[model samples]
Target: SMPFPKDCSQAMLNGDTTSGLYTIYLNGDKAQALEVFCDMTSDGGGWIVFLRRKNGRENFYQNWKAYAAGFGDRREEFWLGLDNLNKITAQGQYELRVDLRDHGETAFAVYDKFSVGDAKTRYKLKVEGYSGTAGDSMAYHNGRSFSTFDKNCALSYKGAFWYRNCHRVNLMGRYGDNNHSQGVNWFHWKGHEHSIQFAEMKLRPSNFRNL
Candidate 1:
């Protein structure tokens, strides 16, 4: 179990910085209970937080994209991003609160909260389909996929937070503000056809992962 400190004074990294992968390990596997606050010098770009596990497993559970609101949309101030980590882990929620602020300096922190349990907040695929119409194309977690080009089929899930959590996360891209494909958004875009050429996948045992 990781016990969190009171404030952002315990930040792991400080100051304005460039883009790339940044990793931090938890005391154990208390990552699902993380609460983060950060201030960006400029909103030209943003970052994501991935959960690390053994056997080459990395899942993105947090994102800090500032482009959706426009240029430098969320700059120069402390703001919350993945403040809902407790909803998925089985750890029964940690009672720790962390805050980030400016004190004539820039900083952020990852506080460890007490106790642990399974992060129940995760994806459980109930139904899936493929190859029918271009509108039937489906992609997973927004990652690049051909669920659109040629054709595909689908049934939708009835939930408000279906895409909020996943078992794995891949950290990729830091291309400019609005153009960055920060991560993938799963979709079942089909029913229409187009001439855009893209790769397609065939079913194989290796195509799916045991989450």
Candidate 2:
């Protein structure tokens, strides 16, 4: 088979359907292509879902190394890994979209700018320019380095996140813990005490004009 496309948008151009799993090429050769989930129907389709949380099938309270390398099942709840996250941005321009479910209600948060630094910088966050009913929670983490309890870089949390001071939206947390700083909570949507029921973070080419 040929090398994977640069992103899901390219995948769709190569004849992919609505939504599924596929390998994406980054800024490297075939061996560096990262397997990711795609959503080819929402907001013009061709999205690469990097992080997903559905009933917390896997533990996300991992160390820095784990977060850097990724975890969980790609077909289910999973993190696409920070190193991979960084490479995609380096390859070209991308936009961020996070679909979420709070309690029983659904909403979304879309960002015009999104990227991360390399591991040497702790995979620092750079999400910005938000729009959607879910509110701009990523503003809290912009320009901050990722942190977990093991990193001890402040933000005393078990799950990993870019901690300026924990987070306003911690999608990767205890499934049902219901803690404001350590739950599947989006502060602006579900508030501080309520944990969301579902979430999946994805990215796409900023200029993917097809529907």
Candidate 3:
């Protein structure tokens, strides 16, 4: 389980109230935290939310592999531009957590945890409304489809299609290459762009044993 406080508001990264760059600390330690910044290019219309982990050296960059690969001991980064800013600003908050399990000497596997709104539920931001997606956006990758889910359940004995992209954020588990075809989850609403709003999010712990 994540050892840090579950309530992100209680954490140092609770808000962007002042509109500037800030670093959120974990357990009041600067060595273990995230470096987040909210910047406007000038006066109006240019705004961006920048997030990265502070890993003892520089900011940690997250890299989602190009294939159906599992992370061992590397940092991952997520990039979202202005399109998602309005959604986050409207919610007034976004919480972050990380699940780390011992792997070797000074090495560990990491999973990023995110929650929206009340910070109690896990959800995904998709373009599809309550009605679901049509055609391409709803189509499955490698004959499987993924959706946003709330809790951490077992991934064993289940068809890849049933849990492929189903519950969660970030397209981390995908098969094949080509980048566009195999692992990327489509975010749209009836052929239009949309933002995914979640009620809660939790990363599957590295030591979690699937049923």
Candidate 4:
């Protein structure tokens, strides 16, 4: 096995160019390796993709435990476990790239800062310094904790997410159920009436920017 890479950026720089499943010591050197999907051919490469929505093959109206543990296939549509997200982001400064599209139109948003709190904190969100065409929809969810239908934390959106009274963007909603708030959505770009057909939340830790 190759020596552990702190993130996809290191692996990519070390010559892992293809985009697919790769292992990283996300938790730490002492902990076992964690599986992650890497995208090494877009926007300068080295992105660790967490959530992906493409064909809508998997159901998104999941319970809290389901959302926490995550589901679906990493190669298709999936949500990388929230616990893994917390562990990866906790290591250092991380940035978020929100890839979204409606039909054939596509746009991507970049956040200079991004981090997710641990399950102990209900997985609170922290995203700021947004820039890109997809708009700053996540700004409204910055400090909110992910809420499911029964755990009863936030607005109780159909799918678990960092909802606040509701949401300006609900990517966790039912896929293909466009024209309402309850579908994969990016309100600022596609509006509440239209759901995004393609979506991804790519993450990358920042130390490699200078390393």
RMSD list, candidates in order: 17.7, 2.1, 15.8, 2.0
Q: Candidate 3: misplaced stretches above 4 Å?
A: 1-34, 39-76, 79-115, 124-176, 179-181, 185-211
Residue 95's lDDT within candidate 1 is 21
Q: Candidate 3 residues 11-68, lDDT tens each? A: 2234333444444333444354443343322122112232222222221112222111
Better of 1 and 3 by lDDT: 3
lDDT of 1 at 148: 12
Task: Give TM per candidate.
Answer: 0.20, 0.92, 0.25, 0.93
lDDT of 1 by residue, 88-160 (tens): 2222222221111122322222222221122231222111332232222222432221111111111121111
Candidate 2: pairs in clash: none
- Which residue runs of candidate 1 sit more than 4 Å off their true CA positions? 1-13, 27-46, 49-211
Clashes of each: 36, 0, 17, 0
Model 4 alpha-carbon miss at residue 136, Å? 0.8
lDDT of 2 by residue, 143-209 (tens): 9988877774234545678876557878887887775566887888887687778899998877775
Candidate 3: 10-residue stretch with minimal lDDT: 190-199
Instruction: List model 4 lDDT by residue over 1-211, tens digit each.
Output: 2478867887787789999998888644737587779999878888999899888789887777888887889899998877888888898899999888776899988888899899889998999889999878988889888888867422344566888868887887778776567778887898877768899998887555566
Model 3 quality (TM-score):
0.25
